[PDB]
Design an enzyme around this catalytic site. Structure first.
Site, mmCIF file in Angstrom:
data_model
loop_
_atom_site.group_PDB
_atom_site.id
_atom_site.type_symbol
_atom_site.label_atom_id
_atom_site.label_comp_id
_atom_site.label_asym_id
_atom_site.label_seq_id
_atom_site.Cartn_x
_atom_site.Cartn_y
_atom_site.Cartn_z
ATOM 1 N N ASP A 72 0.790 -1.356 -0.161
ATOM 2 C CA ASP A 72 0.002 0.000 -0.068
ATOM 3 C C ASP A 72 0.824 1.339 -0.049
ATOM 4 O O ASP A 72 0.294 2.552 -0.097
ATOM 5 C CB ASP A 72 -0.913 -0.093 1.232
ATOM 6 C CG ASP A 72 -2.194 -0.569 0.710
ATOM 7 O OD1 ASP A 72 -3.320 0.263 0.219
ATOM 8 O OD2 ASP A 72 -2.532 -1.857 0.926
ATOM 9 N N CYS A 104 5.302 -10.882 -14.811
ATOM 10 C CA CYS A 104 4.178 -10.860 -14.031
ATOM 11 C C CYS A 104 3.961 -12.060 -13.583
ATOM 12 O O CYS A 104 4.470 -13.157 -14.141
ATOM 13 C CB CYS A 104 3.009 -10.420 -14.792
ATOM 14 S SG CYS A 104 2.751 -11.312 -16.428
ATOM 15 N N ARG A 110 -0.592 -12.122 -19.440
ATOM 16 C CA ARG A 110 0.801 -11.710 -19.425
ATOM 17 C C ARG A 110 1.118 -10.162 -19.067
ATOM 18 O O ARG A 110 2.043 -9.605 -19.751
ATOM 19 C CB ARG A 110 1.629 -12.338 -20.589
ATOM 20 C CG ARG A 110 3.142 -12.309 -20.276
ATOM 21 C CD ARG A 110 3.995 -11.587 -21.243
ATOM 22 N NE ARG A 110 3.919 -12.239 -22.694
ATOM 23 C CZ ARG A 110 3.761 -11.715 -23.887
ATOM 24 N NH1 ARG A 110 3.044 -10.335 -23.645
ATOM 25 N NH2 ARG A 110 3.603 -12.299 -24.891
#
Length: 162
Positions: A72, A104, A110
């Site tokens: 965060d 990723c 992808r």
């Protein structure tokens, strides 16, 4: 699924730059991923989906690691756009071309939300760009992922600034 060296990554050479793209996860395969990108000249690595390792050995070997989705403490994928164009601009400005490797979490697509960003900023409309990147079969049909243009202007980037 670790010692795997037979399947190679894919180099995408755009009018703007060249980006390497690698399937499978990292950690267990990372020990070869790094050795692949540095062979392809991808001395910059950029991660946008989810990060799962700590950049030290590979960074101190000469590689720019960019770890966006870490906590965060990073922004949502809404503002990361300006960071995107300024990155892909600079990673090709710092050298007479070079390469950038991107990764990723393997599952559904992808992370085409990355490459597609340059596709719009070159002059395309994201609704057309779907049919260009999504052609790999799904992975580019989320909400804030594609509705981003409805807030982010395709002008003031890959036209006249630098």
């Amino acid at each position: 699924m670790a010692r795997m060296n037979r399947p190679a990554p894919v180099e995408v050479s755009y009018k703007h730059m060249r980006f390497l793209i690698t399937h499978n996860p990292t950690n267990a395969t990372l020990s070869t991923f790094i050795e692949d990108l540095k062979k392809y000249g991808a001395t910059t690595v950029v991660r946008v989906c989810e990060v799962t390792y700590d950049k030290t050995p590979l960074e101190k070997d000469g590689i720019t690691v960019v770890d966006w989705p870490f906590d965060d403490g990073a922004p949502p994928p809404g503002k990361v756009v300006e960071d995107w164009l300024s990155l892909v601009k600079a990673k090709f400005c710092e050298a007479p071309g070079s390469c950038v490797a991107v990764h990723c979490v393997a599952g559904l697509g992808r992370a085409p939300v990355l490459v597609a960003l340059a596709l719009i900023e070159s002059g395309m409309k994201y609704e057309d760009a779907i049919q260009f990147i999504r052609q790999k079969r799904r992975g580019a049909i989320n909400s804030k992922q594609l509705t981003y243009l409805e807030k982010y202007r395709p002008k003031q980037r890959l036209r006249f600034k630098d």
